[PDB]
């Protein structure tokens, strides 16, 4: 019970009615259900077509271009639950271009567990606005219902009750009625039970039901199982000895084992070697697990455990990265590989990531017209070619037209065995016979090769596999240039030497194996050690250099030549560049902070920064000029864009390439910020800054980077000190004496005196330094007699000072 019919897998029914009858009996589809591309079908064909026993769908339901279909109310009357275990592009119900379809009709569809619904381009579909997706879908924000007949209002969606007062089933959110067809309306359960389902009477179903049930509160009288299905009863979890299967039913070990048995050999495409783990008949053991053949359990494996991968007819072509992504992690390959990589970006390392785990190849390994492959080191773990599947001519290794191939495997560090078959190397210009013969010795295939199987005149050609050695003799460098010499190597026939070839590059790290290189050609010595003089090297840089000879293949035995070992030579250090971005900021009367960044060209390691600061005296003109004269200034010290960008950057670069060839100072060590001490208040300071990479042994380093700053002035440094003495002689001539602010902010530009008779108005008057020095102060005149007031304010470079306390004087009448 609980599922009267059988269970069917998924199907792709197309182009004919002769396959829809496959759902005659089964009540559950263990997969998806696609009915699409129905061109010749007529509406008369669906009148007598129904599958009332269909209840449950695991993956999804899809309809696309089915001509003549009008509604699914007759197709799947009892379709209840769509689990959505596997979604069609995040959609559990796709109805796309369902021409002639008028209404959905799936009135028994209570729940869609996972995914959303995509309904589109349905110019005849009605009854879409009167459906409650919130009561069916847990989250409806992923839906897609557009371009239907309900977009532009043309559907008369009327369902039973409207003539009687929209009765026979309620409405909810506007409070529009929710209903499926013109004769069947949606059944909505009360919120007292979330999704357990309820009968038509109103009483809720059992917790293990889903949507509908015949008897309330009965796990054996449901219609769908919320968690799992067993023996016609819905259960929370599968009890032993039954395992969870497909996340919807419980099966015994026998069923999973038998399914795996049919998947071993008697199914070529699409089967899953089902395994038992966590009491679940999972299709495949997860990562870090292996299958124990005794009971198919996913017993944990220590370290990298085998991941055998099968191949379509055991022959896979890998012409790019994407084909290699499939074979990721395959320790053992039960097939054969075809390598036809004609190019790629950042290969032999990412390719190593994809294909570096293969340890076994059942068939043959083939490399054909692989333009980009420079070496087979990406087969990091390959150790045995079984050679049970072979090509025509019985070939296990088949290398052909490999233009850039230079090295198969480092036989000093690699092992390889080939059980059956013979090698084949043709048209491998950059790979000489030494590597092939070494592989023949290593793999034990020496006794299998016959005539013309190995090409003796198309392989070891343009190959750089010099057997002898070149020893560098004289090497001494400079800050910009490096001189090199080596022993004069002469082949047995001195006419055979075309010259020498020198390779160098910037190699900060010594992990260079010559497998990008500036090449220099050198004429042979005139029968006097040959060498070259590098000219454009950056200072304090590590250069990897080796020397390879250039000989000619003689008609007699080939002279291989000699190549030097890869040596690393470091250029000398020189004067560093200007320390870029020097900024000085004053935050105190004696403290100024100096900040800078390391130079763009250290030309070594910056041992210490050298900082010079020199006091700048104030301008001479500030001492002998009157600043209250008519006309005065107060000395208050403190593709269009691309074209400009490139021109300005070139302008900056132009000058940057030009500069390449007793005062208080200090040496800043390993710091780029500095604060000076013991500075006079409000004094412009000239800071000369230098980066330096050597201190004691005849120090030589960069040119000065200049910046200037002025310290913060004191608030009360400009205050007037001493009494404001007044004096008269006879005729109301005021003679004001007052002491200077001996320590001002820079200097005192001028003084101003404000005087006002008792009850009268105030008049302003300036005092200049020349006037102040000559008159020892100020000498007022031409003012009325009586009692007055005197207020004095001192003006410095920082600004106006604080007015002194007012002083009164009374003159003789």
């Amino acid at each position: 019970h609980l599922y009267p019919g059988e269970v069917c897998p998924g199907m792709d029914i197309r182009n004919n009615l002769t396959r829809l009858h496959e759902l005659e009996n089964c009540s559950v589809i263990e997969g998806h259900l696609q009915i699409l591309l129905m061109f010749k079908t007529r509406p008369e064909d669906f009148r007598d077509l129904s599958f009332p026993k269909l209840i449950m769908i695991t993956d999804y339901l899809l309809l696309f271009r089915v001509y003549g279909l009008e509604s699914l109310k007759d197709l799947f009357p009892n379709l209840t639950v769509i689990r959505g275990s596997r979604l069609f592009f995040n959609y559990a119900l796709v109805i796309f271009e369902m021409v002639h379809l008028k209404e959905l009709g799936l009135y028994n569809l209570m729940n869609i567990t996972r995914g959303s619904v995509r309904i589109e381009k349905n110019n005849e579909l009605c009854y879409l606005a009167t459906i409650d997706w919130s009561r069916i879908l847990d989250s409806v924000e992923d839906n897609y219902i557009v371009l239907n007949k309900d977009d532009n209002e043309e559907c008369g969606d009327v369902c039973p009750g409207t003539a009687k007062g929209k009765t026979n089933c309620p409405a909810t959110v506007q409070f529009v009625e929710r209903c499926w067809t013109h004769s069947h309306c949606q059944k909505v359960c009360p919120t007292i039970c979330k999704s357990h389902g309820c009968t038509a009477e109103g009483l809720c179903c059992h917790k293990e039901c889903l949507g509908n049930c015949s008897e309330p509160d009965d796990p054996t009288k449901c219609v769908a199982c919320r968690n799992f299905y067993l023996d016609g009863q819905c259960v929370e979890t599968c009890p032993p000895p039954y395992y969870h299967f497909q996340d919807w039913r419980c099966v015994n070990f026998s069923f999973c084992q038998d399914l795996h048995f049919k998947c071993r050999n008697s199914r070529k495409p699409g089967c899953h070697q089902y395994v038992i783990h966590n009491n679940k008949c999972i299709p495949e053991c997860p990562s870090g697990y292996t299958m124990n053949s005794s009971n198919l359990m996913c017993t944990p494996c220590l370290g990298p455990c085998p991941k055998v991968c099968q191949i379509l007819e055991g022959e896979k072509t890998i012409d790019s990265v994407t084909s290699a992504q499939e074979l990721r992690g395959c320790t053992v390959i039960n097939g054969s590989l075809i390598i036809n990589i004609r190019g790629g970006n950042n290969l032999a390392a990412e390719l190593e990531a994809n294909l570096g785990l293969i340890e076994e190849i059942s068939g043959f390994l083939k490399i054909r017209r692989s333009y980009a492959l420079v070496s087979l080191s990406f087969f990091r773990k390959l150790h045995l070619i079984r050679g049970e599947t072979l090509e025509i001519g019985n070939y296990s290794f088949y290398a052909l037209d490999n233009q850039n191939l230079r090295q198969l495997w480092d036989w000093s560090k690699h092992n390889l065995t080939i059980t059956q078959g013979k090698l084949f190397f043709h048209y491998n210009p950059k790979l000489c016979l030494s590597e092939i013969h070494k592989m023949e010795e290593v793999s034990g295939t020496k006794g299998r090769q016959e005539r013309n199987d190995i090409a003796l005149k198309t392989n070891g050609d343009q190959a750089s596999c010099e057997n002898e050695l070149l020893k560098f003799s004289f090497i001494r460098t400079s800050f910009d240039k490096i001189l090199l010499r080596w022993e004069p190597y002469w082949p047995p026939d001195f006419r055979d030497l075309l010259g020498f070839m020198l390779f160098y590059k910037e190699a900060p790290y010594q992990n260079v194996t010559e497998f990008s290189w500036t090449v220099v050609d050198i004429d042979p010595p005139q029968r006097s050690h040959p060498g070259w003089l590098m000219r454009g090297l950056k200072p304090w840089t590590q250069y990897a250099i080796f020397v390879k000879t250039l000989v000619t293949f003689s008609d007699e035995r080939r002279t291989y030549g000699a190549k030097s070992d890869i040596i690393y030579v470091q250029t000398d250090a020189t004067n560093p560049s200007v320390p870029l971005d020097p900024i000085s900021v004053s935050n105190s009367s004696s403290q100024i902070i100096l900040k800078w960044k390391p130079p763009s060209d250290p030309n070594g390691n910056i041992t210490h920064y050298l900082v010079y600061w020199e006091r700048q005296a104030e301008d001479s003109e500030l001492f002998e000029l009157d600043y209250c004269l008519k006309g005065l200034k107060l000395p208050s010290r403190t593709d269009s864009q691309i074209l400009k960008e490139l021109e300005e950057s070139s302008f900056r670069k132009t000058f940057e390439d030009y500069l390449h060839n007793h005062r208080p100072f200090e040496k800043v060590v390993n710091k780029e910020s500095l604060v000076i001490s013991g500075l006079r208040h409000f004094t412009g300071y000239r800071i000369e800054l230098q980066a330096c990479n050597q201190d004691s042994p005849d120090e030589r380093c960069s040119v000065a980077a200049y910046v200037s700053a002025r310290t913060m002035p004191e608030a009360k440094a400009d205050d007037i000190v001493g009494p404001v003495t007044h004096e008269i002689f006879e005729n109301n001539v005021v003679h004001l004496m007052w002491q200077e602010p001996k320590e001002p902010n820079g200097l005192i530009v001028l003084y101003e005196v404000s005087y006002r008779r008792y009850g009268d108005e105030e008049l302003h008057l300036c005092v200049s330094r020349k006037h102040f020095a000559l008159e020892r102060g100020c000498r007022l005149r031409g003012l009325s007699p009586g009692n007055y007031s005197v207020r004095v304010r001192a003006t410095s470079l920082a600004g106006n000072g604080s007015w002194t306390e007012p002083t009164y004087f009374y003159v003789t009448d």
Binding site: L483, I522, D523, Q526, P530, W532, L533
Partner: peptide, 21 residues
Amino acid sequence: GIEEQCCTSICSLYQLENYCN
């Protein structure tokens, strides 16, 4: 000449050996 051989074009080391005592 010398400067007419090393910055007008590229001069080999053998040519620099010709300008030594």
